[PDB]
C-alpha cells in the first residue's frame, strides 16, 4: 500500500523530460532491434521528437545559435543529444569516438567497450 506521491512542485525540465527520451531512445533500440545507431537517425523517430519536442520550463524567443533551420527542433537537439549521453551514464550505450556527431553504440544485451579507459 504506503502513499505515494512522485514529484512537489517542478513541471518537467529539459533535463527532466530529457532523462525520460533517453529511455525512448533504449526503448527505440530494442524495438528496432540494433546494436548501433545515431541521434539524428532517431530525430526522425516522431515517437521519439514527440518527447524530444514535447513543451518545459522555456520562455523565450528561441535559441538561434549555430542552427540551420527555423521550426523548432533545435532545442530537441538539446533533449536528443542528452538522451544519448545519460543512456552512455546508464550504461544503455556508449561512443568510443568522441564527437558529437559520432555513432551511438547500444548495448542491446550484448558485449561493449570496457569502461577502463587506461590513459598512461
Same mark, same amino acid.
Given at each position: /500500500?504506503?502513499?505515494?506521491?512522485?514529484?512537489?512542485?517542478?513541471? =518537467?525540465?529539459? &533535463? /527532466? =523530460?530529457?532523462?525520460?527520451?533517453? *529511455?525512448?531512445?533504449?526503448?527505440?533500440?530494442?524495438?528496432?532491434?540494433?546494436?548501433?545507431?545515431?541521434?539524428?537517425?532517431? *530525430?526522425?523517430?516522431?515517437?521519439?521528437?514527440?518527447? &524530444?519536442?514535447?513543451?518545459?520550463?522555456?520562455?523565450? %524567443?528561441?535559441?538561434?545559435?549555430?542552427?540551420?533551420?527555423? /521550426?523548432?527542433? /533545435?532545442? &530537441?537537439?538539446?533533449?536528443?543529444?542528452? &538522451?544519448? !549521453?545519460?543512456? !552512455?551514464?546508464? %550504461? #544503455?550505450?556508449?561512443?568510443?569516438?568522441?564527437?558529437?556527431?559520432?555513432?551511438?553504440?547500444?548495448?542491446?544485451?550484448?558485449?561493449? #567497450? !570496457?569502461?577502463?579507459?587506461?590513459?598512461?
Amino acid at each position: /500500500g504506503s502513499s505515494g506521491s512522485s514529484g512537489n512542485k517542478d513541471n =518537467l525540465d529539459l &533535463a /527532466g =523530460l530529457t532523462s525520460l527520451l533517453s *529511455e525512448k531512445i533504449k526503448e527505440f533500440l530494442q524495438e528496432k532491434k540494433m546494436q548501433s545507431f545515431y541521434q539524428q537517425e532517431l *530525430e526522425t523517430v516522431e515517437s521519439l521528437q514527440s518527447l &524530444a519536442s514535447r513543451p518545459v520550463t522555456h520562455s523565450t %524567443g528561441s535559441d538561434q545559435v549555430e542552427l540551420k533551420d527555423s /521550426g523548432t527542433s /533545435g532545442v &530537441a537537439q538539446r533533449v536528443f543529444k542528452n &538522451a544519448l !549521453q545519460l543512456l !552512455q551514464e546508464k %550504461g #544503455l550505450v556508449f561512443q568510443r569516438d568522441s564527437g558529437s556527431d559520432k555513432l551511438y553504440y547500444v548495448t542491446t544485451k550484448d558485449k561493449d #567497450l !570496457q569502461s577502463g579507459p587506461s590513459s598512461g
